[PDB]
Amino acid sequence: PEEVDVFTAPHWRMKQLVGLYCDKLSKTNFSNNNDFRALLQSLYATFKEFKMHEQIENEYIIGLLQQRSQTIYNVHNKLSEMLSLFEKGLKNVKNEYEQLNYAKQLKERLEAFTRDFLPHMKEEEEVFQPMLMEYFTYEELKDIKKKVIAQHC
Numbered sequence: 001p002e003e004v005d006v007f008t009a010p011h012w013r014m015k016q017l018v019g020l021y022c023d024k025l026s027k028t029n030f031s032n033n034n035d036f037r038a039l040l041q042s043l044y045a046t047f048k049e050f051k052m053h054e055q056i057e058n059e060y061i062i063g064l065l066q067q068r069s070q071t072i073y074n075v076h077n078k079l080s081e082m083l084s085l086f087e088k089g090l091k092n093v094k095n096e097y098e099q100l101n102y103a104k105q106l107k108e109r110l111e112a113f114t115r116d117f118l119p120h121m122k123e124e125e126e127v128f129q130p131m132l133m134e135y136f137t138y139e140e141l142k143d144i145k146k147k148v149i150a151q152h153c
Contacts (some may be wrong), residue, residue, distance in 0.1 A: 007124050007129055011125065014050060014053055014117075018118070021046055024043075025107070029055050031111075036093070043110075047083050052152075054076065060144060061128070064144070065131055068136070069134075078116070089106065
């Protein structure tokens with residue numbers, strides 16, 4: 001039921017963001033300083049919204065589900081490292097040799113990030129959403145989703 005689903009719309013926005021940076025990345029001219037900085041500026045804004053996303057889940061969803069089921073063990077950092085990588089590109093890359101070296105690193109890290117992020121969202125939808133249905137009443141889930149949408153939008 002739509003009104004108790006706490007993941008689908010947030011994740012629709014996160015995957016739209018993934019699609020946009022994958023697009024930007026494949027089209028960026030890493031030899032061009034303006035293109036390079038513009039890309040890193042997008043990614044920084046984007047990964048900041050990813051971080052707001054995980055924090056919202058921690059604060060409004062997971063920390064509650066954890067309290068009631070107590071089947072929590074995997075904590076729900078990578079995002080701060082990605083953001084730190086972007087800051088570096090923005091503050092410490094000063095010519096074309098450094099841009100192109102950095103570019104190879106960025107691409108590898110973004111690829112690895114992207115391959116983990118998508119499954120991580122799938123798992124919340126497939127695992128946590130069902131648990132939420134058992135540990136909370138229907139109106140309780142409706143209330144949680146009201147709060148999660150307010151924080152994301």
